[PDB]
Design a protein around this ligand. Structure first.
Ligand SMILES: O=c1[nH]c(=O)c2[nH]c(=O)[nH]c2[nH]1
Ligand SMILES: O=c1[nH]c(=O)c2[nH]c(=O)[nH]c2[nH]1
Ligand SMILES: O=c1[nH]c(=O)c2[nH]c(=O)[nH]c2[nH]1
Ligand SMILES: O=c1[nH]c(=O)c2[nH]c(=O)[nH]c2[nH]1
Lengths: 287, 287, 287, 287
């Protein structure tokens, strides 16, 4: 009978920006995919179509490019400027969500202005402003890893639907997707990203795995124990199955050498590793 | 300084199931992409690699196929059976999240056992159990719609970065992605899905749009007002830009006929239309 | 020692065009993905960077939109116009390849100007011009089909690497990818496309399959036998495996009802069905 | 008026193989996506469903894994083994087409058995056997490159649809997709691939580009001039547009710093650079 407008947000998504720094002959490249969405009083926009409060998504896009002209130290510093601009520039805009994917480039043979894409991972950043409060979540994704041994899986309950054989030697392969929330915007964003990346990789490789859940816990633990500015880190790790092919029918054996890398289905293990005492449900993990 | 395991879940993702009903010559097809994840006490599994509580993702997979043998009336009913099985079959399992995508098939010229895929839309369903609480969210995605007229956008503020020209006649194109939460399990799931689909399409097409926001509001309003079993519906609608090409440099006019369909960037308008008084932030939305 | 520039072509690829017909209240929609590439004397452009013969890809793009203004009955007609324009307008351009994907839209409840995308198939057209000769190849792709029965596979040879079991009842699923070459440009393109589509579907569903190769042959034969204007048709059909899941480990049988739809690998059966006497290797197929 | 079976081939496509070498604690990883297709006398299989000559695609799949058990020096040599096996092991099999994609992995901190994927490029190999002739085409794809300067485009004709302005400073970005045909199978496949990759990147980066066509020509020339075993190299280079954003309406200049990286459309420049006097129509290119 009675209808109400709940949570809502709008903006320009996937604004592909490439910023070249060339004050000198040694060019630098920053490559981003930016998304900007505003939150505030947009009641009349939805109920009557009154756009008095609707800062056009096209305008939001223009602002991204206009601000890029001044340059930015890091992706997070750039998002901070955008959110500050919109929340403060319009009285009816009380906050928003600004995010970006950062793509890496490597110089071609150390050339001053020629590069190739490093597609092995994608860095992410998300800024959320709610009135007087703001929070930043950084992350990494698309980083595929694999252990050819040093992985086990046994001791699991065996019910009517269980057929999986226990094993003390299997391949452990996953795609590293992690996102961590900072407890302060006063961070050396680039240095921490590199550190976290190394910690996750190290924990994955050096942990003798008794389960993907265990490996993930150790990856998240290393990060929390190492960075005081991080209150928690969330991870979503698929278990990309590599089946040891049965070669007995061909008169052969398969000593953990020949595998069939299956696409789907896959295991999906997810968890939040956090610093004792920190809040368990920050708003930034929603909408 | 103390590290602690927070929210977590695990299971098998994207189990592709095709169920054929052939007790009669008139074969029927049910096509799903199922994901199953459990929640409960998995503390030891993460901190010590003790898998006593870890129902193998392989087992969860086997269960999906075994349960499909008995058949199911709807996707939601199928997910309900899985959720009850795991939560009740294991004491340390207190809940979880079971989701599925349903793909449609049409008979080839009414053939008894030959079909073609209807890729114009994908139906979704998600069941979440938390203790004694159960919640179901159904939805639709991948349904692309377009209005060649009956759309306007003007009256928006103009700042230093605004260059967009007001208009009273433009193309409005989007991909309908909607999800609605049921307030009861006593629902004719297939009947409501077909009805909601028709209501979203009807509202999109018949509403003289003054803004995508207004169109989205009308689509949601229609659903809430028609179905007592729905407490809220969320929508994420991209505004897929179709630019009117300027042919004047060539001495030709373009009476809203020739357009360039851009990929990115795109506007992204999202909102929640709720039944007045209903829950503000159900946990099923955060996953 | 001696390097030579061989075959070459260049142009603008994937120009997204949406042409709306609104002479009256009953709007029509034509949605294309156009690619234009030229062939001729571009020796100096490659070897010396002399761009005198290089009609800019940007110009080719503009030409596509400029020609769209005048409208067009069929996709093939539109491509013919482009080919004629470039070959005759520049003396050093001796030929080219113009291609397009045509996307289908359906009216929303018979609305005058509101539509929904029919994503169940994509139509293709390719025009190649060489000197004074031209050829057109039309096609269909993305049309997924499945037979729940009426498919067998037995009688194949067995070697030491053979483990497949014979069967008289299996699911046969594929993606219909077919392309056919017209032996004249005087064709009712839209009518032949609709007919061919129908013939392929009929042969697929109605042929009791003893092999994917056999079904494909029948599909091709139906087309050649029905349309005099078609000299040959090439098909590429993957065999989308739907494995009958083994439920015996769970105490159940599986009477051809529960299947696992695997992604990869997949069988890939390809063939050219030709009209006795027609050309054996027309250049359009190579590119 | 009669129907004839023309060219045809069939087999198993995209067989995902991971071969782990673990003779010592220093594990090695070989990751391939293999496709196997046979050619020969399959007339009866198509016209009558007689499968006597049809070596099951499932059998072809099995052979891939069985052969992997013995290990292989390079991707090309693995394909050669498969091709010879099928062509020599079946009288009605006169040839075929075997191809593979090779995915690269890097050790994590020089770890003995932990690796991460290098997704910056994918290596390819295609082998076609016809009687006693064995033809191999190696290649690379997915290698995105970009020059921030050192690229110009001017001197092109300005026809009636030309609006593009001349420029002496622009970004040149492309996806390096190249394939070269060896004139002998006696090649150090890994060494030549590494050399070719280096030469393409070197020519792309150091050539002051007056056009994408020129840059492509220099890339191919370098390969042909350096490797006697290569008869020709074909490249398909998209011109991925990075449009210099006009910030003048916002009161700012933009000294080649802020760009909009567009998705579509894109220029597509392609050409074959051959060794003078070599075969210009090898069958392997038709596929
Ligand atoms: O590390 C694992 N965790 C699981 O929950 C699981 N389930 C499974 O089948 N294999 C694995 N492996
Ligand atoms: O319906 C619209 N809403 C917006 O917020 C917007 N912004 C924009 O540029 N075009 C539109 N259209
Ligand atoms: O290097 C180029 N070659 C072209 O053929 C072309 N066309 C165009 O618009 N830009 C470019 N650039
Ligand atoms: O119709 C088929 N053709 C094949 O060549 C083949 N190979 C296979 O394993 N199954 C099938 N099915």
């Amino acid at each position: 009978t009675k209808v109400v407008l709940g949570q809502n947000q709008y903006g320009k998504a996937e604004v592909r920006l490439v910023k070249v720094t060339r004050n000198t002959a040694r060019h630098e490249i920053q490559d981003l995919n930016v998304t900007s969405q505003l939150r505030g009083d947009f009641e009349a926009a939805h109920t009557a179509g009154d756009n008095a409060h609707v800062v056009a998504t096209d305008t939001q896009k223009n602002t991204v490019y206009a601000f890029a002209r001044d340059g930015f130290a890091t992706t997070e510093e750039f998002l901070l400027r955008l959110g500050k601009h919109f929340t403060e520039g319009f009285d009816w805009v009380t906050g928003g969500r600004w995010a970006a994917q950062q793509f890496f480039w490597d110089r071609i043979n150390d050339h001053d202005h020629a590069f190739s894409r490093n597609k092995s991972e994608v860095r992410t950043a998300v800024l959320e402003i709610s009135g007087s409060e703001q929070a930043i979540v950084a992350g990494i994704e698309g980083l595929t890893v694999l252990k050819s041994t040093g992985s086990e899986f046994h001791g699991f309950p065996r019910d009517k639907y269980t057929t999986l054989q226990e094993t003390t030697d299997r391949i452990l392969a996953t795609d590293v997707s992690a996102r961590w929330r900072y407890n302060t915007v006063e961070v050396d964003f680039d240095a921490v990203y590199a550190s976290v990346r190394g910690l996750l990789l190290k924990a994955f490789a050096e942990t003798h795995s008794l389960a993907l859940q265990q490996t993930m816990y150790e990856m998240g633990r290393a990060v929390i124990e190492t960075h005081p500015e991080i209150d928690e880190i969330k991870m979503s790790l698929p278990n990309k199955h590599h089946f040891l092919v049965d070669l007995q029918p061909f008169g052969q054996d398969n000593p953990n050498e020949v595998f069939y890398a299956a696409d789907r289905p896959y295991g999906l293990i997810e968890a939040t590793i956090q610093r004792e005492g920190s809040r368990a449900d920050h708003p930034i993990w929603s909408n």
